[PDB]
Amino acid sequence: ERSEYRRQLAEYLQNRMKAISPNMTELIGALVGARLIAHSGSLVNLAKNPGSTIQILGAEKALFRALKTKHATPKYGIIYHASLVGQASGPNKGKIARQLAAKIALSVRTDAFEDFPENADDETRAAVGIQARAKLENNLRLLEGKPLNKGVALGPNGI
Amino acid sequence: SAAWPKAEDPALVQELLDCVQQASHYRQLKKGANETTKSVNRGTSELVILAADTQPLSIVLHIPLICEEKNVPYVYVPSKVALGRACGVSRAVIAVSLTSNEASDLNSKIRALRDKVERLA
């Protein structure tokens, strides 16, 4: 009973998230967006963050350790378990981390301030997150298909 | 619209651009939305200039709230790409914001500039 309760809870979470901020859940998904909003306190409390704050939203002990003793900074927080970055790879994962950061800050300010004439379908409402989805997934497939470094092809002899 | 401290007055806008350009040569100026917001949250800023004609205006509508809170003036130019190549980076900055130091004629120019903005209010 507890399990089913949690299941339908998550159903509610995704639906209510689409209701509030369709752009962000068009980017990343209701669960990780919910985690963000949670650590934010509020939607506007999130939307006053800058893009880099969103990139490392969460990793607070790790961040402040590396800064207060001058070590290498953590690269991401909850965006790691977010869905889009799992299809990158390594150095690509960092580049996607930055790009997903900035476009998320965009979407959050968008849904957090842009009004809509309330005869407004959700798709026309979330077109910007959709655009971000498309552009960004294209960029991810590109950097995945970045070639490797041509090396001189050796034959049988050293020739 | 929402850009209610609009600055269309031409000599005013030209003075703002030139001051930004001078400040860009003095490294006392932050280029971009995200960095503007960082600068104001860290409080170091002393003036902030935005651009009216962005297509979703909302990505900069979050700045006036913070600057009303932390009490620094903000003002809109009408042309983003003008602001961008005023910084000198070739891509249309939408938000620039320039800060204070101790002893600079540039600091003086900033003070007269924010006086002009408070006039425009």
Binding site: F64, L67, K68, T69, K70 | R42, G43
Partner: peptide, 30 residues
């Protein structure tokens, strides 16, 4: 640079706190 900024932020907050405390401890009236 990053380290310097963090310590700068903390000290800025502390100056804010201390300024408030100093003022509350201590042609004006018509």
């Amino acid at each position: 640079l990053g380290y310097v900024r963090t310590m700068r932020n903390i000290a800025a907050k502390e100056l804010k706190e201390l300024e408030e405390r100093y003022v509350l401890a201590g042609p004006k009236k018509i």
